[PDB]
Amino acid sequence: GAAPAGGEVRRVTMYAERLAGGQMGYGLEKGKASIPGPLIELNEGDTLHVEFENTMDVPVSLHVHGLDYEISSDGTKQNKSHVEPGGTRTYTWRTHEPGRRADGTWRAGSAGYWHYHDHVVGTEHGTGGIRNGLYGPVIVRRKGDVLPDATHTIVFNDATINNRPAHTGPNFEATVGDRVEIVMITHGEYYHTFHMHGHRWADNRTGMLTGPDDPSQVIDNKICGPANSFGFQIIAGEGVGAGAWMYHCHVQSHSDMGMVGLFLVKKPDGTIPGYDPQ
Amino acid sequence: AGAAPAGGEVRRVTMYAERLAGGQMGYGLEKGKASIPGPLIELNEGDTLHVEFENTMDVPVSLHVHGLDYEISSDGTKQNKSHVEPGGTRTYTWRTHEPGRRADGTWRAGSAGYWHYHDHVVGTEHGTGGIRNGLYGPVIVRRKGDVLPDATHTIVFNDATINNRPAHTGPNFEATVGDRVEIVMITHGEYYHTFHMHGHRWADNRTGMLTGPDDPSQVIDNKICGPANSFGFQIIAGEGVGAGAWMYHCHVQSHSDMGMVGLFLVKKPDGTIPGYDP
Amino acid sequence: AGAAPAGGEVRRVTMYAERLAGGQMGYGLEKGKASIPGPLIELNEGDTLHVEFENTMDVPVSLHVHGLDYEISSDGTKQNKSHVEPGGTRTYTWRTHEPGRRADGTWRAGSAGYWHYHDHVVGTEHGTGGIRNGLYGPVIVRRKGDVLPDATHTIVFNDATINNRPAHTGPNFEATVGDRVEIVMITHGEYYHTFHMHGHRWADNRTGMLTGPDDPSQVIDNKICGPANSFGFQIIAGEGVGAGAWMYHCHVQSHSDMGMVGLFLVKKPDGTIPGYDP
Amino acid sequence: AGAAPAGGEVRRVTMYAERLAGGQMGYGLEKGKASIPGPLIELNEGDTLHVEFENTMDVPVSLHVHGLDYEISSDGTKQNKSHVEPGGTRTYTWRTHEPGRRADGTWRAGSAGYWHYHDHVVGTEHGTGGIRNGLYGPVIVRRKGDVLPDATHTIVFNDATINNRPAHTGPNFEATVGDRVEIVMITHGEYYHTFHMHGHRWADNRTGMLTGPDDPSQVIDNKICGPANSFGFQIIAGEGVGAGAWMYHCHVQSHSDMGMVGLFLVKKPDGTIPGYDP
Amino acid sequence: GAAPAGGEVRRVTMYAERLAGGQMGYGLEKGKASIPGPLIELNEGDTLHVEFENTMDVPVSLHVHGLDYEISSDGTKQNKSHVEPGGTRTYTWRTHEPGRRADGTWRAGSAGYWHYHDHVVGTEHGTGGIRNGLYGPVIVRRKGDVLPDATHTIVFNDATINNRPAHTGPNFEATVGDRVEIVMITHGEYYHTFHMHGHRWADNRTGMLTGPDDPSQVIDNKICGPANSFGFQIIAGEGVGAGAWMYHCHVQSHSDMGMVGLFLVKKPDGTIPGYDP
Amino acid sequence: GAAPAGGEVRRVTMYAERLAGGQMGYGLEKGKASIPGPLIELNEGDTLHVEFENTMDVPVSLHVHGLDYEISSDGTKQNKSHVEPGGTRTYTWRTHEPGRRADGTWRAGSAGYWHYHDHVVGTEHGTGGIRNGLYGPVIVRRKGDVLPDATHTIVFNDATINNRPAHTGPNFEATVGDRVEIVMITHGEYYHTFHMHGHRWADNRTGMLTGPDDPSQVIDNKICGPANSFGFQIIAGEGVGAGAWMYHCHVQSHSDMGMVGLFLVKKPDGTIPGYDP
Ligand SMILES: [Ca+2]
Ligand SMILES: [Ca+2]
Ligand SMILES: [Cu+2]
Ligand SMILES: [Cu+2]
Ligand SMILES: [Cu+2]
Ligand SMILES: [Cu+2]
Ligand SMILES: [Cu+2]
Ligand SMILES: [Cu+2]
Ligand SMILES: [Cu+2]
Ligand SMILES: [Cu+2]
Ligand SMILES: [Cu+2]
Ligand SMILES: [Cu+2]
Ligand SMILES: [Cu+2]
Ligand SMILES: [Cu+2]
Ligand SMILES: [Cu+2]
Ligand SMILES: [Cu+2]
Ligand SMILES: [Cu+2]
Ligand SMILES: [Cu+2]
Ligand SMILES: [Cu+2]
Ligand SMILES: [Cu+2]
Ligand SMILES: [Cu+2]
Ligand SMILES: [Cu+2]
């Protein structure tokens, strides 16, 4: 499938809730917070009203990258758009199509791989909240962008992936030929290099080349730093087959620390040849 | 919006390297008016620049430029004997070229882009002292037909500082909604950083703006950079988001927490910023 | 200049992993002829390479490749028994493919690009020990019609060193004004770097050369990179700048001060280098 | 209370290195009961200790101790062939000695003090990965006449963790007013730290207590420490300040913010803690 | 002179006010809070009731190092000893002399160079209130401790000295021979090394060797970290003469970025040889 | 051996010279600059006139920690006590014995493990000259201090030891029983922790306990920051035997990155068991 043209006014409920161990997550239903927060998907032109509720004892905010918003939905104490304990607030995100301005230039549309995160827990820049788990993916699709069979979000948050304990994945399963979307977000203090075995993508907006004239480097490794976000779509096992295809940060100490995980690609019968959790 | 013309002019300027307060050092076009960053040098592709340089300090100094064409005699390094002695004078010559087809059928990249110059001999043979002290500044080379901006602002991440300013002192930049605002982003020193602008985004290519609908450049509001990286871009101030104190900062979390933040102050036509208390 | 042909050949080469003087490890094509970096492997899109590999050491080793197509059996990891035992042999198979349109209508990125290979098992299960000891080398896969260079040099930033050489000891590379020179830049280990070349600049895309007037890729003389990053470019030596000893170095200030520096000795036709006192 | 007797005993003990939940690894004197911090070893000066060591893991491990006497054979390094291969055994032998007047007129420092042991070969030849996984424990060597404590609690700062415990999960320790509580403080990892204790203070000397009115050691409640530092002290719980939940934490602000905090739960004789409601 | 025996009950008012540019300081009188907060001196044995008053619109607290206080005066939120906006509270600090315990041990006295600071603003550990400036020095003297001609407090708070902007001192003035007391506190995120040109001290409780039997290292340079505190007294210009004697953090980027100051030591005739600011 | 009473007037010539790979060092003879610079030993009471020669193209200085010096030998641009390019200047260091003052307090002597370094190259705090190699050790001995068989200086300068490339030691060799003196200085930007295998020392002036009454902690691991110096003496292999005894920074990545060296202790014959270089 392909993404339609957008322009719908959408509405969703979000909650910030504490989780086990000092963690904090966003969710769509309450008691259902997740780290990372729920995937938000929009087509260019859509408006999203986030009816936001802070179920915690400390203030929290919701700040987004890439998308259009007014200063009232910045999500910062500096602009007084945070949410006091037990409070509620409507965060409005807008998105727009690319097009030709009157001056002759081309306006960049909103499409891309983006993210949202806290901006006031711990510090005026959300360092505690981000640490605590208050981050999530946002995909904005352009008319005609190819839709995946599945989307998986991988966040390098300091020395952890998705705030999971070290050496605990997460793992993603696919079958050969699946079109699999990866959303990649980085947070915290450190730079990282995200690597995938057996697969590769184009370093551009969609992670796929537009055609034979796209000169974007094709890569399997990409340096990123805090609040970087990119994404891509690969064909699972393409030209390489089924297997437990490793992905990991490729900074040596980081991978040794357990910033590693698995792309479990299965044949149609379900077999992953040679796979053997030790 | 203005457009840059074809270059090819031969230009001459004076430059001085001078001690400033508190152990700092800056370049300047007029004696006694050094600044950090140094003066913005703008050229059209094909232009030549003779920098009639004078070292008013008690230590050898140099001028090394990125991206432009220069013979070894204008390298600005000790090992080429192209530094300038205490009190000395030297003419540094930069050239630029248009792109074009070589006789071999390959395409020769032009000089156009966002560039910079800095010291290369103070403290160490790589100008570690001079760079820390403030001996850096922006260089813009335009291609014919590049869109010209209403204003240009230079933002240098230098170690843990912005433009060698004390933590938490900006700098801030002012615009009116709809202004065409050019940002030149330079990094120097020891540390990687990520530049982030609230409410605004640009394309990750030469100009910061997409050439049209065929350009697959990732559109971003966040970019990792390390010492001597330079990029630039243009935005329409407030476009789709409205007036406000729009934060820009390093997004490395402790860096933002320690004062590597500033304000893109986008004003309404009446000169006011809703919800900004100065 | 010549151009690369279309690929499609089955190629075979033997490889060995030896201890080298002073606690280092290397890859070589013949026994006793191992280097750091290992030997350059050049393929054309579509070629298959069978690497017949022998671990001549007293410790397990592996051979993991970036970017190329391989089955899981050639992942080169202990995690799925693709590692080699001391004295053991194994055939690692690498395939490549041209770009082309998939049945689902999308553009499948080809294998062409600047890649590398390295160990994945010495020291740790991510080859931290092996890479630090020197177990890495370059792979270039060319696409039909790619311009062929007069020379290729590989510069690997490994921890605080260039090509495991001791600090302040190059390497230097020689060329003659007008030579078409190809650089392969590989990063490994723990740190981020910025690679910089005096006198020269390239396009930030697959080939490092702009495809023509419609390629909007930034033109750069400086690039941040992190562990397992690889890129490449070609430059016309001395183009628009003439002969000389042109520095390349990491631009992280402490890194260049510690001696992560070298020289691109660009010679006049008579063999001389103006301004180079050796 | 009691006093340490003169030492001089030859002691034997079994130690096991084994995995735990989440990639962790610990030392124990019994199988299946390995812990983090490892078991507390207590000796009187002159005592010898033979640790019959078993490595019940699939990776090599070793035992290296601070402060105590040992030959190169018990160094516990890969470089002195004193590590323990997977599933191997080894007798690690530590010796201790009283102070004394040497022949050459000088005073020989005794072994008494607060020490520690940790792995030295897991992950790197310096045990970087082993220490990270929890392979560390405290050794106390007492001098004849040293005051003995009611209770000993070990606090290890291991990067961002206390005793490899998840963030904000203590650990807490319970005392009664008047108890003589002995704290051992070890530090590991990459980061410096400042251990702080509400309600109590101590002497910055060997034992943590002033020898008498002539001892000029600083009395502190806060001291800076870094990787492999070890010290200890004794306090009288509640002495002059009463019962309560007295906090202890690293005082580096970001460290305490992310939950490097525990509690010193000092109860009144009747078991109550005034104003401490969970 | 020298310090006498302690044992007096003292009382003081202290205020938590807002200051210019996002600051927050403590002060003994309304409108005159300072960064660092005022100097509190006591003799071992004294009690101090601090009549505290939060004049801000966020909660504040007062938490002290070294001295004796009941949990009632921890000055922390989880111990409900913090202070609401507008709110008042009495914090009570006690000090004790050293002496031999009945147990046979030696009980360490209260004497030392300590400090107080917020514990609630921004985080449950006072991260914001410390950054904003809510810190100040407390000195507990033992009977017989020599008294100084002046005391100067120097706080490394992140990349600042006393929350003052980079390259702005502070500077302190003395005359050759003055007995100058220095109190040094560290806060925030960074380690530092405090260095003093021209002078040295003993790394012990008073910063002066007790005599020939004191093995304490004599230093001019000390690494410290957040909440560390120590002090010393020096004879200004002793063995070195007048001059603008720098003090600075010796972490190189810190000193380049402005963590520097001047101990301006004059001759009796008032001169500072070669000083040329 | 034991240090005598000082009081000699001593004179040395010191050169600052450029060295290969962008470095600079101090040397006692022309053309013989070294990193670390030469070891300067004095007995308490000695005066040292250092007749300094700047052979380089940049202003340079000599700044000493711990010892007595007038402001004209401070070694900073601020009062023009640097040395211009090609120029000369005589820096004078003095040192005094411990003694009691008329005010009854104890004046600590100059004795200790000290150091000298540039203060003007690159920045006003010598950040370039320090990183380039302009640093060296100063030992001031007290009458009665025991004299070592040898002295080795280990300088943690940023992420190097003695400006040497990573993983290149340096190693120091001794024989079991040797009385070995270690001088340890830190410079630059980072903190470190110095650790030595199989040996230990007292955290005090000399690194040796004064006797059974000295409560100084006995350690084998110590945190240090920029411009810190300390030192000690150990009996090579005492109680532990001959062996390749590793010393390293114990910050884990620093040790993994080669901040490591070997204390090669040989048996009376000259061999080191277990040592397979
Ligand atoms: Ca691109
Ligand atoms: Ca002491
Ligand atoms: Cu943002
Ligand atoms: Cu922000
Ligand atoms: Cu990582
Ligand atoms: Cu953000
Ligand atoms: Cu350069
Ligand atoms: Cu930054
Ligand atoms: Cu440069
Ligand atoms: Cu891998
Ligand atoms: Cu580098
Ligand atoms: Cu790899
Ligand atoms: Cu060790
Ligand atoms: Cu800590
Ligand atoms: Cu406290
Ligand atoms: Cu150790
Ligand atoms: Cu606290
Ligand atoms: Cu500092
Ligand atoms: Cu505190
Ligand atoms: Cu200084
Ligand atoms: Cu270190
Ligand atoms: Cu110094």
Numbering used by the authors:
A (entry chain C): 41 to 318
B (entry chain A), C (entry chain B), D (entry chain D): 40 to 317
E (entry chain F), F (entry chain E): 41 to 317
What text comes from the article?
The structure of the Met199Ala/Asp268Asn mutant form with the resolution 2 Å demonstrated the most notable changes. The structural analysis of the Met199Ala/Asp268Asn mutant form showed that the Asp268Asn substitution led to the Asn261 side group conformation change. The high-resolution (2 Å) structure allowed us to detect the rotation of the NH2–C=O group of Asn261 by 180° and identify the double positions of the side group of this residue in some chains. The NH2–C=O group rotation was defined by the new environment of Asn261, precisely by the NH2 of the Asn268 side chain, which formed a hydrogen bond with C=O of the Asn261 side chain. As a result of these changes, the NH2 group, rather than C=O, was localized near the TNC of the Met199Ala/Asp268Asn mutant form, which can affect the overall charge and electrostatic potential of the system. The Asn261 side group double positions were observed in the B and D chains of the Met199Ala/Asp268Asn mutant form. However, in the structure of the Met199Ala/Asp268Asn mutant, the geometry of the NH2 group of the alternative conformation of Asn261 allowed this residue to form hydrogen bonds with water molecules W2 and W3. These new hydrogen bonds allowed Asn261 to be involved not only in the creation of electrostatic potential, but also in proton transfer to the TNC via the water following from the central trimer cavity to Asp260. Combining the Met199Ala and Asp268Asn substitutions, as well as Met199Gly and Asp268Asn, the pHopt shift of 2,6-DMP oxidation to a more acidic side was detected (pH = 7 and pH = 7.5, respectively).
Laccases (EC 1.10.3.2, p-diphenol: dioxygen oxidoreductases) are among the very few enzymes that have been studied since the end of the 19th century. These multicopper enzymes catalyze the one-electron oxidation of various aromatic compounds, coupled with the full reduction of molecular oxygen to water. Most of the currently known laccases function in acidic conditions at temperatures below 60 °C, but two-domain laccases (2D) oxidize some substrates in alkaline conditions and above 70 °C. In this study, we aim to establish the structural factors affecting the alkaline activity of the 2D laccase from Streptomyces griseoflavus (SgfSL). The electrons from the substrate are transferred via the His–Cys–His pathway to the TNC, which is formed of one T2 copper ion and two T3 copper ions (T3α and T3β). For this purpose, we constructed mutant forms of SgfSL by combining previously obtained substitutions that significantly increase the catalytic activity of the enzyme (Met199Gly, Met199Ala, and Arg240His) with the substitution Asp268Asn that is outside of the TNC environment.
